[PDB]
Write a protein that binds this ligand. Structure first.
Ligand SMILES: N[C@@H](CCC(=O)O)C(=O)O
Ligand SMILES: N[C@@H](CCC(=O)O)C(=O)O
Ligand code: NA
Ligand SMILES: [Zn+2]
Length: 153
C-alpha cells in the first residue's frame, strides 16, 4: 500500500478512548507547513495533539496524525464515528489544489475505505456549520474519483 509517514507528535502519549468510524471527513486547516507545526498549533488551543487522523501535504506526502483507534477531535458530534483527513493549505483563498496532493488524497481515502469498510465521505461542511474544507476545495471532483461505480449509473 501507499507510504504513510510516522513521526513523533508531542502529546500522542495521551491518546485514549475509542472510535468506530463509518465516515471520512475532509478538512483543510488554513495552514501551510509540517504536521509537527500543525500539532504544536492545535496544542496551543486545547487539543492534546492534532485533531486530524491524517495530513496530506501539497507534494502528496501523507502523515499519520491522531491514531484512528483513539477518540477523535476533527468534527463536533463525530469524535467516536469518523476519520478526519486534513489537506495542507487554505482552500478559502487558494484556487488550485496540486494534482499530486489531490491524487494522494484519493489514494489515502480509497485505502481507508478498504481497511474500515467505510461508505460515506464528505466535507466537514456536510456535518457542521463551517466553510471547511473551503470554497475552492475540489470536493465534488474528489468524491467523483472515489465513486467510480457511478459511471455505470
Ligand atoms: N483536548 C481534547 C479536546 C477537548 C475539546 O475540544 O474540548 C482532545 O484533543 O481530544
Ligand atoms: N489538559 C489537556 C486537555 C486537552 C484535550 O484533551 C491539554 O491541553 O493538554
Ligand atoms: Na506519531
Ligand atoms: Zn474542518
Amino acid at each position: 500500500h501507499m507510504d504513510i509517514k510516522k513521526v513523533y507528535l508531542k502529546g500522542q502519549e495521551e491518546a485514549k478512548g475509542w472510535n468506530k468510524p463509518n465516515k471520512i471527513i475532509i478538512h483543510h486547516p488554513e495552514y501551510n507547513g509540517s504536521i509537527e507545526g500543525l500539532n504544536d498549533i492545535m496544542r496551543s488551543m486545547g487539543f492534546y495533539m492534532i485533531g486530524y487522523n491524517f495530513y496530506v501535504r501539497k507534494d502528496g506526502t501523507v502523515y499519520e496524525g491522531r491514531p484512528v483507534w483513539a477518540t477523535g477531535a476533527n468534527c463536533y458530534g463525530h469524535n467516536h464515528d469518523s476519520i478526519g483527513v486534513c489537506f495542507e493549505g487554505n482552500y478559502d483563498k487558494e484556487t488550485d489544489m496540486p494534482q499530486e496532493q489531490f491524487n494522494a488524497g484519493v489514494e489515502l481515502i480509497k485505502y481507508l475505505k478498504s481497511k474500515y469498510g467505510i461508505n460515506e465521505v464528505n466535507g466537514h461542511k456536510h456535518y457542521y456549520n463551517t466553510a471547511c474544507p473551503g470554497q475552492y476545495f475540489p470536493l465534488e471532483k474528489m468524491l467523483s474519483c472515489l465513486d467510480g461505480q457511478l459511471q455505470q449509473e
